[PDB]
Amino acid sequence: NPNYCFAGKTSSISDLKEVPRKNITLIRGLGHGAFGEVYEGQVPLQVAVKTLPEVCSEQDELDFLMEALIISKFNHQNIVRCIGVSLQSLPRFILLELMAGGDLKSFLRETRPRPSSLAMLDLLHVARDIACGCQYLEENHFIHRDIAARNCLLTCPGPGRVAKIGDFGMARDIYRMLPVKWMPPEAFMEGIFTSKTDTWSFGVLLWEIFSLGYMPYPSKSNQEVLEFVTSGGRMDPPKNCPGPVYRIMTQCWQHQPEDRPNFAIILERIEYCTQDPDVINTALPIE
Ligand SMILES: Cc1n[nH]cc1-c1cnc(N)c(O[C@H](C)c2cc(F)ccc2-n2nccn2)c1
Known part of the structure; x- marks a missing residue:
């Protein structure tokens, strides 16, 4: 598993908050931005759901994991929050503040x-x-x-x-x-x-x-x-x-x-x- 360092502290996928897939419902599409489709969803907490296409190179998957680690590590009112991820089901999700x-x-x-x-x-x-x-x-x-x-x-x-x-x-x-x-x-x-x-x-x-x-x-x-x-x-x-x-x-x-x-x-x-x-x-x- 790939490492990431921010403000010194090191983290890995193990530190991401996995949300049970069963707790996640998709509502509507919001559009996609080269990486894949994004949906409005609920976990009730409203979320934007960034998805990883099941058909992807392992490089795409690494990029996806890294994005998760990067945003989860920030803590500031003008940076979008990450509610968590769902990486143990396909397609993989990153869950953001809606x-x-x-x-x-x-x-x-x-x-x-x-x-x-x-x-x-x-x-x-x-x-x-x-x-x-x-x-x-x-x-x-x-x-x-x-x-x-x-x-x-x-x-x-x-x-x-x-x-x-x-x-x-x-x-x-x-x-x-x-x-x-x-x-x-x-x-x-x-x-x-x-x-x-x-x-x-x-x-x-x-x-x-x-x-x-x-x-x-x-x-x-x-x-x-x-x-x-x-x-x-x-x-x-x-x-x-x-x-x-x-x-x-x-x-x-x-x-x-x-x-x-x-x-x-x-x-x-x-x-x-x-x-x-x-x-x-x-x-x-x-x-
Ligand atoms: C509602 C709504 N309507 N239009 C957009 C939203 C929205 C709300 N909350 C989010 N967290 C969110 O995140 C995605 C990853 C995102 C982040 C960004 F910086 C720029 C664009 C996108 N984007 N727009 C469509 C697909 N991708 C999107």
Whole structure:
């Protein structure tokens, strides 16, 4: 059985909480993300059920086990909880906290203001939530490598929503298709990853958030983005984006890793934005 170390402590599949398969009922599909299908389920505790296809390479199965160990070891309010696993029956399950708000990218898309609602403060709270998750990862020396709106989840649609990081598939692969639009130069050029990798990606997530769910670098392909960013190019501000928010982005995208803020600083600047009336009184565009 494969080992895993986080915050020092070592763990193995033996440490995962096995839930009796009989206690698990599937309700409906939620979609699949390359790894396999995910269902809403119950154990009554509401869960999202990540499944391993019974037809898979042993490498797929190892990846699956590792993902289980990674998420079970985190303990933070802005990282999705693992209720447990069911590995002793096929297909194998990983059981996650059900985030009723769905993923962040689709939420932003479906909830953007129209003549038929969202405010700057809602976007800032999401940004703060994920920054807090990233800060917890940073201080535990875990590099996520794929911070992006599609990998974040919301507890609910309404104002009290809490955003959390919900997928760790990229980190799992590296621990043992590239998200180039979320990657800093040293990452996609040299394959160098550090805490400052996630800072760059967070800047891109911020853009995704305040653009309300647009794809980064609109109209550019991966290679054009690679060349654009390598030559010092950066995204323009999203529509109606307050200058203080855009400036967090541009600081996250500093070419030198050492010139980019750590997450404690990012959280400070996000806080300041939420206090600033000229920021939060700015109306979002209505499509
Ligand atoms: C309800 C609901 N509607 N739409 C999504 C959910 C949902 C709630 N809670 C979860 N724990 C959850 O987890 C999966 C693994 C996930 C995690 C992530 F970060 C990004 C995407 C996905 N995803 N979306 C569909 C298939 N895979 C999904």
